[PDB]
Amino acid sequence: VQIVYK
């Protein structure tokens, strides 16, 4: 799945 961590 799409994962967005910055």
Partner: antibody
Amino acid sequence: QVQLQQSGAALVRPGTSVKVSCRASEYAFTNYVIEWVKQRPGQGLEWIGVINPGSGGTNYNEKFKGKATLIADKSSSTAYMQLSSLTSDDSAVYFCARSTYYSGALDYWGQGTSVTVSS
Amino acid sequence: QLVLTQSSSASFSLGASAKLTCTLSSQHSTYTIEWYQQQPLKPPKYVMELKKDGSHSTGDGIPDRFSGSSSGADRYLSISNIQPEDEAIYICGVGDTIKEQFVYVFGGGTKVTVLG
């Protein structure tokens, strides 16, 4: 009004470094991240990287790994992108933009900084 | 492999209905994308976030003429009653975190022309 204000137009010589500034105001600097976007004159947007001001963490497009260095100063609420070894390829409009830690939206964008590498 | 493919830079009559397509790479079918508007010599503007189910959340000062919708890997930006101010390059973006390494990628853009 959420605002990001970048340093002005820069005309520099090949082989040199440049430092564009991105000053945040009217929002919590360390509750969001700063991302940098290149745009050559007739071309589409190109993503360079992101700095997490609160962590100092950086993520970069692989293409700019030897070219762009991203840093942020919390006390000044200001983000900086250093471009090194300037070629005529590096001649573009550089944008800064706000994003969240956890979503993709670049929701607010700086005005931009025209960097010209010319002889 | 994370790839956004934008339909061909196209024209619409003033006050007509426009439907732009941003298509995700097969394996990234489920992904949330963002639409961006770039007007002549302006910085890009955030238009919306758009999810697999076609639900969307629009940016500051985006009129309700702009809606989003989805079908499989396809992400659509619909402009009803298109206006001169809607003349722009519409760019889609998508984020993902692969190896704890975050990457954002943009589509090539669709240049939108408003006729009449």
